[PDB]
């Protein structure tokens, strides 16, 4: 059925022929809990590599719109926001990627998780790529599970940049991340830092600490992946204004009250399934300023953040809080 406009008024204020083109990576995370992030108070150093990079802002109060991939991911790109979002018609609404594409931003979505849950469906098929495949993903033979790794989504991104030379570009990288129940499969051996590790599929039967250890090892691999995504962006910082946004789709229960995994209806899902990390990084020269770390934020902040990163105004989100500020220091 027809696309419902939400941002027919949208205007891009500046074009990449008159200022530096902009190149952004949005890491769409998976199953990561805010309270297992070092920066949020967790006693283990689960993000050591991000800790070494200047310009990373950690957001300590971010709540997901839902508890599953199918519910959260479309809402993350929505104009409706969590309070009026309808998962069953999301696919036919104009979303933020539709707006950016029709204003001239080149969109790419690589997926090592599942798929875009309808978000990419109106855009050309070539702009979505399945990186769960060992033909597309060159980093699947580093572990005994033969599991394709998130970092494999960075291979060959330079081909995309070259094919879109001088244009604005937004690249979504959809992580496997911390998906369970088999946390121990989610990371290569170099990240097996917390030990012993639950390597059984029935989580209630593992010793609790061993379950936490596997989960935290998987976060170390995500810390690595985000750090390498920033390092990749940094190779383009002379020609492009580069930024990286990370937000997880939802959190995870880890045995509290005997609850495991996620997906529970929002009305009674525990807070562990809704409190998510978010990080924002930008190069010094972009002029983008992050919001305060402790801003009360939700998935509703993503769409206005993506629009602002490309200098796009849309009436529908004019009052929303974003991850980045409206005011610019000169
Ligand atoms: Zn998920």
UniProtKB/Swiss-Prot annotation:
PTM note: Phosphorylated at Thr-69; may represent an intermediate in the catalytic mechanism.
Enzyme Commission number(s): 2.7.8.43
Membrane topology: Multi-pass membrane protein
Alphabetic keyword roster: Antibiotic resistance, Cell inner membrane, Cell membrane, Disulfide bond, Membrane, Metal-binding, Phosphoprotein, Plasmid, Transferase, Transmembrane, Transmembrane helix, Zinc
Cystine crosslinks: 65-75, 140-148, 198-206
UniProt keyword annotation of Cell membrane present: yes
A single Gene Ontology CC term: plasma membrane
Residues in compartment: Periplasmic: 1-325
Effect on the protein of changing residue 262 to A: Abolishes transfer of phosphoethanolamine (PEA) to a lipid A analog in vitro. Almost abolishes resistance of E.coli strains Rosetta or TOP10 to colistin and polymyxin B, by comparison with the same strain expressing wild-type mcr-1
Binding positions (Zn(2+)): 30, 69, 249-250
Record-level Gene Ontology MF annotations: phosphotransferase activity, phosphate group as acceptor
Cellular location(s): Cell inner membrane
Swiss-Prot/TrEMBL catalytic activity: lipid A (E. coli) + a 1,2-diacyl-sn-glycero-3-phosphoethanolamine + H(+) = lipid A 4'-(2-aminoethyl diphosphate) (E. coli) + a 1,2-diacyl-sn-glycerol
Activity regulation text: EDTA may inhibit activity. May be inhibited by ethanolamine.
Outcome, altering residue 252 to A: Reduces resistance of E.coli strain TOP10 to colistin, by comparison with the same strain expressing wild-type mcr-1
Domain of life: Bacteria
Remarks, miscellaneous: This is the first (November 2015) reported plasmid-mediated resistance to polymyxin antibiotics; although it does not confer a high MIC it protects against colistin treatment in a mouse infection model. Colistin is one of the last-resort antibiotics available for multidrug-resistant Gram-negative bacteria such as K.pneumoniae, P.aeruginosa and Acinetobacter. First identified from a pig farm in Shanghai, China in July 2013, retrospective screening detects the gene in (slowly) increasing proportions between 2011 and 2015 from pigs and chickens, and also in hospitalized patients in China.
Function: Probably catalyzes the addition of a phosphoethanolamine moiety to lipid A. Phosphoethanolamine modification of lipid A confers polymyxin resistance. Confers resistance to polymyxin-type antibiotics such as colistin; in the E.coli strain W3110.
Subunit field text: Monomer.
Protein's name in the database: Phosphatidylethanolamine transferase Mcr-1
Native source organism of the sequence: Escherichia coli
Whole sequence portion shown: 217 to 541 of 541
